[PDB]
Amino acid sequence: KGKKHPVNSYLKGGILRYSKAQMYKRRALYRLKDKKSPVVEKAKVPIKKSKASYPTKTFVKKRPSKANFSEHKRNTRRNLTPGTVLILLAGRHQGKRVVLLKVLASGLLLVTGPFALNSCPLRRVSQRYVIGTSSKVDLGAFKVPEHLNDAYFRRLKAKKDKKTGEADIFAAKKERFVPNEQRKKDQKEVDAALLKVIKAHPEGKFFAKYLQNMFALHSSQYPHRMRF
Amino acid sequence: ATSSHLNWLIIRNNNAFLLKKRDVKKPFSTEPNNLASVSSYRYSGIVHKKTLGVVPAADKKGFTAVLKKGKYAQRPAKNTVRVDFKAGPRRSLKKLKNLLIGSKYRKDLTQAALRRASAVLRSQKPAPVKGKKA
Amino acid sequence: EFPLVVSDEVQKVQKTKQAVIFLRRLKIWADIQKVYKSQRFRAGRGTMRDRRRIARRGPLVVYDKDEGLRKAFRNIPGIETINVDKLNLLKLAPGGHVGRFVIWTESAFARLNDLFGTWKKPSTLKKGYNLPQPKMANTDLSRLLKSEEI
Amino acid sequence: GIDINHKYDRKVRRTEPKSQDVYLRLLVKLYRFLQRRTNKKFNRIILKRLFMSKINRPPLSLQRIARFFKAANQPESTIVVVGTVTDDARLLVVPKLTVCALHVTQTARERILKAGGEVLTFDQL
Amino acid sequence: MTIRPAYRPKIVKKRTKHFIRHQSDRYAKLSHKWRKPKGIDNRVRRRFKGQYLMPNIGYGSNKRTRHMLPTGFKKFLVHNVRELEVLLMQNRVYCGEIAHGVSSKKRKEIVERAKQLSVRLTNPNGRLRSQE
RNA sequence: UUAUUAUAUGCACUUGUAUGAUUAACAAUGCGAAAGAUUCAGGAUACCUUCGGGACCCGUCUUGAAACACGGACCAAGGAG
RNA sequence: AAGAUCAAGGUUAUGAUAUAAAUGUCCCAGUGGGCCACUUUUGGUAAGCAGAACUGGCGCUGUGGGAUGAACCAAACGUAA
RNA sequence: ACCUAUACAUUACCGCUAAAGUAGAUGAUUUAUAUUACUUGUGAUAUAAAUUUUGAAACUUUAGUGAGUAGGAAGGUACAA
C-alpha cells in the first residue's frame, strides 16, 4: 500500500527517493500480468461490427494541431487567509470590503460582504483584485463552501431560449437576473453566522455597522504606506 | 527513349499546361491527370503509368469516372485508353475509397486520388445542397 | 499510336474532304478542331504587319512521295506537310518547344531510316553527321537508384 | 561592432554545374545520392568533376588511356574519364579495356570498340 | 461565410505607408512611385532621422504571411471557367480574381462555377449591374 | 569506522517534467445569427483632428552644399553607355 | 658543394588564431584634386597657411553626445519589443 | 541613485552568407490487433487504421552577419515588338 518521495521541489533537483529505494531494494520478485485487449471486431454472424476508413481522407482543410494541456499545479496562494476582510478594487462592488470564505480549484476567492450589511453577494473574485487586510473574522462557524463548488453557481441556464430545443425564439431570457431560491437560502444561512462573529468588533469603516460605510483613503491619504 | 526523369526537366518552364499566375514561385498544372493541381514531379503525365483521372459525370451524379493507371504493359503509347482505363463507379464514397486502396498496388498517390474524390463531391453535391434548409 | 504510322495510300489523296475523313478516323479530330476555333485578331500593333495572329499548329503529316498530298493538305488550317528529305526543325519543334503531333505515311517512316541511318549507319544526306550518342544509356535514374546493386 | 566580419564569405566553388544540360545534371543527381549514402571519395569527387567548366575538363586522348595500362596493378581497370575522349592516331596498338566517359568522339569510339572494349556511360559504371 | 485559408500568424504589414519617393509632396512631376535617392546631397540616403523610410529589406514580411489576403486567400488571376477549375483542389490557399477584361456573360458563368467549386471570389459584384 | 552519493529500483497507467523557439490547463464574453446582417477587435490609406519629437533643396562639380555656389516657375510627352 | 641513397629519433620541439587559406584570370572598374585630429615636424611671427612621418576618421557616416556643427567623443545603423 | 544610440543582451521576423539531409513508392514509415516463431520479450506474416505523388535547376533544417559614395556582380519589375 505505498512508498513515495520526491522532495525535489525544495532542492531543486534532488533525492531522498533514489537513496531509500536502494535500502529497501528487492533483488527478487519480478512477475507481471497487465492485460491490454482492443475491441477492433469483425464479429460477423450476421452482426458484422467493423469500422472501415471513415474519413481522414483529404478534404485538405489545414486545421491547427491541438496544443495539449499544461499541468494542474495547485495555485499557491498569497497569505490571504480565510476570513481576511479584503477590498474589491474593481467591478460593481468597487471599494466594498468583503470576507473570505474559501479557496476553490479554479484558483479564485469566495467573498460575502456579509450580504445583509455591505450589499455584496456570494460572489467570487480574483486573488489579484484584492488587497488582503490584517483584519480577521473567525471563519470556524461556517457551513463552508464545500457545498459551493464551481458547478453550483454555474448558470441554470443560458439556453438561447425557452428550455426545449429549436423554438425560433425571442429577445430576452435572463442572462444575469431572476433570482433563484436555492442561492438565496445558501446566502442567508452563511450571512447569519457571519453577523454573529462580526458584531464583536467596534463600529467605523468595515466589520459590522463598521461594514456599511464605503472605504475612504481620504484626500491626503496614502495607498503606499497603508500597510493594509 | 522515355524516362520519368527527363520529361519534367524538358518541360519545367516550357509547359503549355503549366501556367504561372502572378509571382507565385511555382506552379499551376492543368495537365489532365494532375490529381493535385500542384505541379511537382509526380502530380503529372509521365511519370509513367500511375495516373488516376477523375471526371464527373456528365449528368450529375452517377459517376466519379476513375481511370486505372496501367503499368508496365503498353508503352504507354497512344492510347486504346492505356494509362487510364475508365471504371465508371457509383453509390457511396467510402467504399469507392477503400476500393481504391486495393487497386493501389501502386501506392504513390493515395492522398491525390482522395483529393479528387473529396473535391468531386463538392462538384456533384450543389444541386441537392448548397443551402442550409433544416 | 505513337509513333503514328498510317498506310501509304494516304499520299494519293487528291481532295481536302477525303483528307479530313481520313485524318479524323485516324484520330486527328480533336486536334484539328483545336485549330479553326482559336483564330483571333492580333493584339499588337502586329495586325498591320500582316501578322494577323497565331492559330494552332495542329499536325505535321510527313510523306516520302507527293502523289497529291500537299495541295489537299495545304488548305486545312494549321495542318502542314513536309517531305522526309527536308524535315524542318521549325516545323518539328515550333517555338523550340518539342512535341509536335506527327503522323507519318508508311513509305515515309521506312524512309526515315537511311535518311538518318541509326547510330551505326550514316545519315546519307547529312555527310559526317553522326546523330548523337546519348550521355546516359538508361536515363531512368530511379531504377539505377532502386537498384539491388547500389 | 563586429571585428571583423569582413571577407571572404562568398566562396569559390559551384554547388551545381553551370549548364542547362538535362543529362549532365541527372549524373550529378545520381552521384549526389551515392555520395553520403555510400561514403567513399570516388562518389565525392565525380560529383564535383561534373560541376567542372569546359576548361578544367580538357579532352583526354586515347594514347593516355594506353599508357596507363603500362602501370603496375592496373590491367583489370575500367578507366574513368569525366570528359571528352579524343582519338590519337599515333597509337598503333590500342589495348582492350572498358572506358566510361561523358562523351566519346566517334573516331575514339571505333578504336575502343575495335580493341575490343566497351564504351560506357557513367550511369552504367 | 467563405472558410479562410490555412491558419496564418497575424499579417504584419510592416511599413504600411507607400514609400512615396522623396519630394512627391513637393512636386506632381515627381511620381509617388518610389525611386531611390542616389544623390550626393541626400539626407535620405545617409538615413538621417525624420527623412521618411527607404525600402530596406527588414520591413520584409514573414515568408508564411507572404501573399495572403487577410481573409486568407492569395490572388489567382482567373481569365475564365477552365482557369477557375485549377483552384478546385486549392480552395484553401487561393481565390479566383476575375480579370477586368472579361464580359458579364462569361462572369455570370465564372461566379456560378465559383459557387459550385466553393472557392472564394474576391469581386462578385464584378460588372453587376442593373444592366442588359 | 562512519557519513554521503550512484548502480543492483522491472512492468502497467499517467491532463505528471523536459522533448532542445514547451502558453496552455481552466473559464468568461462578442458571434459565424440562410439571403439579410448585429456586435467585437484592429489600422498615419487618401485626408481631416488633437499631442510630442524629427524633417533646412534637389540635381551636381567639390574636401565639404541648406547655403549669400550653379541649373531648375509649373506640368505632359520626346530624350542620352 | 649540391643532387642525393640508407638507417636512428617519446611529446614536433613560443603563444593566441585562421573569419578557411593559397593561387590564376579579367589586365577589371573607380582613383592619380584630398580634407581633419592625437602624436612627431619643416618653412613661416602666425594662419581655418604651405609641406612630411605614423596611425585613425571624414571622403563613403547617420545615430547618441559636444546647445549647435563633415571630421572631436561614444558608436559603425536589417525590422521591432 | 537616476536618464540614455540603429551600441550592447535575448526573442520573433527579413535578407545574405554559411553549414547538413532530402532524392528504395511494383516501395518506405508509423500505429493498433490476430496468428506464427523465439524468450521473460522481439521480429516475421496476415488483417484493419493512418502518412507519404518533394520547381529534389527546391524545400526542410541550421547559424553568423547587414553603414555605404565611386564602382562591380547577382536577382526582379515596367514598356514596345
UniProtKB/Swiss-Prot annotation, chain B:
Gene symbol of the encoding locus: RpL28
Per the record, the similarity remark reads: Belongs to the eukaryotic ribosomal protein eL28 family.
Q: Which GO terms describe its cellular component?
A: cytosolic large ribosomal subunit; cytosolic ribosome
Q: Where is this region: Disordered?
A: 121-134
PANTHER family (alphabetical): 60S RIBOSOMAL PROTEIN L28
Select a single GO molecular function from the record's annotations and give it: structural constituent of ribosome
User: Pfam family of this protein, just one?
Assistant: Ribosomal_L28e
Q: What processes does the entry annotate via GO biological process terms? A: cytoplasmic translation
Q: Which UniProt keywords apply?
A: Ribonucleoprotein, Ribosomal protein
Give the protein's recorded name. Answer: Large ribosomal subunit protein eL28
UniProtKB/Swiss-Prot annotation, chain C:
Q: List the disulfide bonds.
A: none
The family annotation for this protein states: Belongs to the universal ribosomal protein uL4 family.
* Name this protein carries in UniProt: Large ribosomal subunit protein uL4
UniProt organism field: Drosophila melanogaster (Fruit fly)
Q: Whole protein: which stretch is covered?
A: 152 to 301 of 401
Swiss-Prot record, chain D:
Q: Which GO terms describe its biological process?
A: cytoplasmic translation
Keyword Zinc in record: no
- Its main subcellular localisation, reduced to a broad class, is cytoplasm
Q: Which subcellular locations apply to this protein?
A: Cytoplasm
Q: Care to name a GO molecular-function term for this sequence?
A: RNA binding
Listed A to Z, the keywords are: Cytoplasm, Ribonucleoprotein, Ribosomal protein
List the record's Gene Ontology CC terms alphabetically.
cytosolic large ribosomal subunit; cytosolic ribosome
- Protein family: Belongs to the eukaryotic ribosomal protein eL18 family.
Q: What is this protein called?
A: Large ribosomal subunit protein eL18
**Which source organism does the UniProt entry give?**
Drosophila melanogaster (Fruit fly)
Gene label: RpL18
Q: Which residues of the full protein are shown?
A: 2 to 126 of 188
UniProtKB/Swiss-Prot annotation, chain E:
Q: Which UniProt keywords apply?
A: Ribonucleoprotein, Ribosomal protein
Name the SUPFAM superfamilies for this protein: Ribosomal protein L32e
**Which Gene Ontology molecular-function terms are recorded?**
structural constituent of ribosome
The cross-references to SMART domains, in alphabetical order and at most eight, read: Ribosomal_L32e
What are its GO cellular component terms? cytoplasm; cytosolic large ribosomal subunit; cytosolic ribosome; nucleolus
- Xref: InterPro entries: Ribosomal_eL32, Ribosomal_eL32_CS, Ribosomal_eL32_sf
Q: Name one GO biological process term.
A: cytoplasmic translation
For whether the record's keyword set contains Cell membrane, the answer is: no
UniProt lists the family membership as follows: Belongs to the eukaryotic ribosomal protein eL32 family.
* Protein's name in the database: Large ribosomal subunit protein eL32
